[PDB]
Design an enzyme around this catalytic site. Structure first.
Site, PDB file in Angstrom:
ATOM      1  N   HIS A  96       1.015  -1.298  -0.158  1.00  0.00           N
ATOM      2  CA  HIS A  96      -0.097   0.067   0.003  1.00  0.00           C
ATOM      3  C   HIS A  96       0.862   1.131   0.078  1.00  0.00           C
ATOM      4  CE1 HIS A  96      -3.796   1.979   0.370  1.00  0.00           C
ATOM      5  NE2 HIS A  96      -3.507   2.625   1.716  1.00  0.00           N
ATOM      6  N   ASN A 140      -5.361   8.771   3.592  1.00  0.00           N
ATOM      7  CA  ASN A 140      -5.512   7.093   3.036  1.00  0.00           C
ATOM      8  C   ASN A 140      -6.576   7.381   2.005  1.00  0.00           C
ATOM      9  OD1 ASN A 140      -5.234   4.508   2.982  1.00  0.00           O
ATOM     10  ND2 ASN A 140      -6.627   3.984   4.340  1.00  0.00           N
TER      11      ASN A 140
END
Ligand SMILES: *[C@@H]1O[C@H](CO)[C@@H](O[C@@H]2O[C@H](CO)[C@@H](O)[C@H](O)[C@H]2NC(C)=O)[C@H](O[C@@H]2O[C@@H](C)[C@@H](O)[C@@H](O)[C@@H]2O)[C@H]1NC(C)=O
Length: 225
Positions: free
Chosen positions: A167, A187
């Site tokens: 990620h 995020n």
């Protein structure tokens, strides 16, 4: 340098997006950084296309995984990136339609910093804070605990060497609470996740590679005012 700084309060960060069931964090971290750098340099904030990167960055692997630096390189090579509006997010692999895009946001260049066992934590933290003050940066990270996060300062929890790169997040700033320093990271899992879509990551924990290896590979777009 400020004791704290947050670009998300400076009108250069788009709203928190949602990547869905597609491992495109790399693409969202890249658009988020370009969106910020562009706004900082031109005074205009506009949402950019993650789908164009997913479909066009041949070196990456679309919804499986990809890279922040390969996205910036692609953008320099292709004269800019399309807007979110003009090249909508499908959350899946698609055919590259870059040639059909008219309006593009360009970047001048991009930087990368991959830590080696020759660097110290102090140098890593110093350089990263330095980059962040200029413009938000994208960092690879092991997000194994993200689905467990709800708030507060994340200290690394279950992460341990070797840290996987599954990620990417956007570091938009830093601050400190009760003697605990942290990065402010945007995020791409919706505004309902974490702290309004953001996660505070503890810094200066002692490990050169940082929490879940976030100090390892930083990359950001460069745009002159
Ligand atoms: C590290 O892994 C632990 C085990 O998977 C996490 O605890 C588990 O968290 C789940 C979601 O919050 C919860 O349903 C499980 O019951 C729990 N497992 C046990 C046996 O406690 C842990 O998450 C943190 O600690 C737990 C206890 C909860 O307080 C979570 O809210 C916390 O995030 C992981 N460490 C992290 C994410 O920092």
């Amino acid at each position: 340098a400020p004791e704290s700084w947050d670009w998300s309060k400076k009108g250069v960060i788009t709203k928190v997006k949602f990547q869905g069931q597609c491992g495109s964090g790399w693409a969202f971290s890249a658009t988020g950084a370009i969106e910020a750098a562009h706004a900082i340099a031109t005074g205009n904030l506009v949402s950019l296309s993650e789908q164009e990167l997913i479909d066009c960055v041949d070196e990456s692997e679309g919804c499986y995984n990809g890279w922040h630096y390969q996205s910036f390189e692609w953008v320099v090579k292709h004269g800019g990136i399309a807007s979110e509006a003009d090249y909508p997010y499908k959350a899946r692999d698609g055919k590259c339609k870059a040639n059909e895009i008219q309006d593009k946001v360009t970047i001048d260049n991009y930087g990368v910093q991959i830590l080696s066992n020759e660097s110290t934590e102090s140098e890593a933290e110093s350089s990263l804070q330095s980059f962040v003050l200029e413009q938000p940066i994208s960092v690879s990270i092991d997000a194994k605990d993200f689905h467990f996060y709800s708030g507060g300062i994340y200290d690394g929890g279950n992460c341990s060497s070797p840290y996987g790169i599954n990620h990417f997040v956007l570091i938009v700033g830093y601050g400190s609470e009760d003697g605990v320093d942290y990065w402010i990271a945007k995020n791409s899992w919706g505004e309902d996740w974490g702290i309004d879509g953001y996660i505070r990551i503890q810094r200066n924990t002692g490990n050169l590679l940082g929490v879940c290896g976030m100090n390892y590979f930083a990359s950001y777009p460069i745009i002159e005012k």
